[PDB]
């Protein structure tokens, strides 16, 4: 309701680059996957075409559901608060 009841606090990981630490970011719930991909591209300086995002909730360890469709939102994939976001390139 205050624009702070929608933001999902997710921790980002980098399996490819293990030297990097962990960063926990609050992203809007209705934020499309395309916007998150563009943000990650502008941050890590990696092109958007070479990016693969996945979400993994803590309730189901070991699972890794891919995010293919870029037009959908994070809420469509049942992304709850406190889910890990893996990025591969």
């Amino acid at each position: 309701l205050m624009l702070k009841n929608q933001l999902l606090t997710l921790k980002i990981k980098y399996p490819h680059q293990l030297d990097q630490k962990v960063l926990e970011k609050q992203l809007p719930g209705s934020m499309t996957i395309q916007k998150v991909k563009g943000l990650l591209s502008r941050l890590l300086k990696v092109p958007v075409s070479d990016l693969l995002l996945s979400y993994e909730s803590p309730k189901k360890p070991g699972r890794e559901i891919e995010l293919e469709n870029d037009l959908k939102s994070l809420q469509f994939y049942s992304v709850e608060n406190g889910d890990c976001l893996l990025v591969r390139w």
Binding site: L1, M2, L7, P28, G38, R42, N69, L71
Partner: protein, 1103 residues
Amino acid sequence: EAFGESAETRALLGRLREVHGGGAEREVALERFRVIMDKYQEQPHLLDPHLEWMMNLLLDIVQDQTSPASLVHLAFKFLYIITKVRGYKTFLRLFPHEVADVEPVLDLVTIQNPKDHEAWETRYMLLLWLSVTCLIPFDFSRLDMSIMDRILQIAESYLIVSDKARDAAAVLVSRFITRPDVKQSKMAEFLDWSLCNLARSSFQTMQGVITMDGTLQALAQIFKHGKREDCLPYAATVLRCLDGCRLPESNQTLLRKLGVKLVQRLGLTFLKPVPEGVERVIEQLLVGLKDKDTVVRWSAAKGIGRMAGRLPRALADDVVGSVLDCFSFQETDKAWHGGCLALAELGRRGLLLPSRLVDVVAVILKALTYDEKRGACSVGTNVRDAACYVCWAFARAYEPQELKPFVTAISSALVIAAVFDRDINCRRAASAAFQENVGRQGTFPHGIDILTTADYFAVGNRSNCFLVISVFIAGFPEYTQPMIDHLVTMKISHWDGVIRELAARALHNLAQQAPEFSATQVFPRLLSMTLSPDLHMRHGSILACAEVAYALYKLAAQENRPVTDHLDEQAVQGLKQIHQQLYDRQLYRGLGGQLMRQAVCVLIEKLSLSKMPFRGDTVIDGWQWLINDTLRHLHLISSHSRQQMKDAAVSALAALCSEYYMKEPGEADPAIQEELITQYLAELRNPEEMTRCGFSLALGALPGFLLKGRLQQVLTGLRAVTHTSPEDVSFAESRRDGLKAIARICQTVGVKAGAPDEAVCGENVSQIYCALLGCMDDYTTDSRGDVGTWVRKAAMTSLMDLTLLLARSQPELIEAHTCERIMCCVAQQASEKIDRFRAHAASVFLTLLHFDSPPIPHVPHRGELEKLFPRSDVASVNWSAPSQAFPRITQLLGLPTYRYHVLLGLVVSLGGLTESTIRHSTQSLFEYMKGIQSDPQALGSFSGTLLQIFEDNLLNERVSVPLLKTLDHVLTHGCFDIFTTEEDHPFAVKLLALCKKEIKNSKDIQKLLSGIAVFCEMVQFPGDVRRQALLQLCLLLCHRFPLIRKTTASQVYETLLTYSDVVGADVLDEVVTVLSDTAWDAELAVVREQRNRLCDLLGVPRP
């Protein structure tokens, strides 16, 4: 083929103990096993050699003394699956059958609960296993409650259940009581119990019906697998008790079936391998033969056949007579089917006497063509199948010397049924019967010739059975007249138009082999049958008369003769009173008359192609009046059969005008020509759309000699009628048909220099291309939808229809600017989003670019287009699929010429409404831009053309919102990174100015959101552009729609979290805290202070 799932199934069976622990993996394994074992449900014999070890892996676990309940339950389920896949009769023989497996399986069955619908399979297969173990030669006394008592109790407990265990219990009872030591001990008690249960159960009670079914099945199995010298004493009382059960007068099919089975087993037992009680069973079976169900009649026929196979000759003759008596006209189709089944069962064993052949054969003549229209659909398919089965059995029933006289009544009956029927099963049965008769007796004429052509696969296709196979079989004299007679006395009088048309085409194809018979004995009947009360008959009587006339005209044309060489003065006289005797009987009135509208029309074209001697008679005037009335009253016809009737009328009118309307070679009667065109063009302004379309199509189908001296008038009329007038804005079909007629005229008149008012030349082609280009641009919309597209396609087909004409004759008339505009329009159409229209435009472009006879002059970028569209990648490229069309069409943007229209057409699919199309278009655009993302010239030109397209398409919502969405998607990807370097970029200031006026005062949440997203994405450009974007965002934040406010706040937060250089370090945190602690969907009074504080923090002016 072989068992490929050998190792897989072995591993699946081995991995069992470590699966039953849970529930998910167990269900997965069960589903996998079922899917693997169901593949051999059609060819189960493949599992024969692989069924010995599999069972060995499923039973040893059941006999283990340390196995849990779930494991044995899963094993029993797998065993039941294997048994219901292969067959218990062929699978129980491999089970243990020693005397040490009788107490481990009988006592094991006493550990199951009959009220457990979860583990029920275990209670089924085990009864079968007990029946298997009961086959040992040893006695039960040496092994000793006793075992026989427990077995009887278990059987009398599962026989009264509504689960699948009833069949297993009945099988066990049948295999147990029929033993040496069990017959003289436990048999009368079970019989008395069954009699009491039958005299204590009902058909209305759900439990009573189940008990009756169970006891009847048990009795039937006992009498089948029982002795003849032991069951006869009790058979009398069994039949006496069954007679009172009132099974025939019950509302259950299974009960009646079991009763018929039990009464035919009793009858068989009464006889030896006539006493009292046989007549009772005979009459009961004769009465039951007239059932509604198919299983009851089949069982009754089987029982009657089995009884006749053991009775004297007089009894067999009486049974045959009683069966034949069930064929009178007063009977029903069920009685006929039962009689046919009984006759087949009797002939299968060879019991019928030759003296009956004089009658039975006749019954077949009326059985192989049983067709009684019962309301909507007709009946008689099962009757035809039974007749075919009887004919097949006749191959072995009688001898050839006895059937000799009936070799043309059975070989011609089989030929007519296996080629001119409506069901494929009946045709296949007839073909099989014919093959069996040819293989056994071999007396039919040309049996091998009919078997080679009419094969098991060729007979499946019905359309081929009425053309290729029909003519091949009728080529012989023995199948020339009967086939046509049957087609005229049956197939033509059908209740389906498709069947009537098929029969008419078959008669047309067959007339070429017998011109005399099809013009002396077939024409007189069909000519008089056109005056019957029935509509379909008259419709099949007009079609048959039109096909024979066409065939006779063609046959004559071979000898340079007329069609009157075959038709006498009485034929042509009666063919001229067809349109007159309908108009007189107002037959064309009503929906029934619409059939006569499609009939007489077919009679006008055919007769118009034979050059009949009707020139200068009232029949031509009558046909013209009928055609005009049919073309004018088109709105009174259903939309389903609206195009077919219109096309038929247009073809008939064209044929009439080309044949009859012709004074001298290359000329026409001035009077009739002036009379036609007058009304033809006057009706083009008819407020009705259907009439306008019909008259336009009629004008477009006129020949060339009639358009001499009056082509300019028709041209200007068709040009003025195809316009988006203020009174006819939603007239899409009218313009479509007008363009179609214009194209047809341009194609039929050809080209001829120095002749504007006769053919196409340099004085009207410029007015033809202008009208085509004007009609091309059409994006009308109404409640129905985007119907304008229906016209756009019709324009494309026209632009080509003319381009290939002038290119083949006087190519110099084709200008350069006109061809360039046509190519640009074709590219724009191919860049559309619809699949069908996109594929059509792509095909038109490929045909226009890959014409070489001569090639078409003035094609912008011919070499580049040919290189980007190879000749081999034409049929394989699926233009209908966006994936196989967008990456192949986006390459046209590289060409300067194909950059404006291509981009304008691509903007609608990039910002469209479909998720798959938008994704593919965006991917193609990104792949195309990745190659021109370095050189600033390409990006600058792209930005310039995009701004021009957006500025020439402002407030056209059709293109503003798609263009805004495309801009947002491109900015989200970041294709203008080099432009972000300098401040106040030209494409970054022009677009901002355009977007503000575009959404300015917008009451659409669709274009408002796009503008908000564009403004949020445009913040990357530093300078005054970012300040203006922030000011506009802060201004629109105070909209009157809470949804707009909250979406704008979310987008602002997103673009702020994305770009970090938009706000300082000690200001960004405060801005984020303010945005996180504010309600952007509540009363604007409190939101005003937050907006003011945000503007003061970010430096945005305070309006």
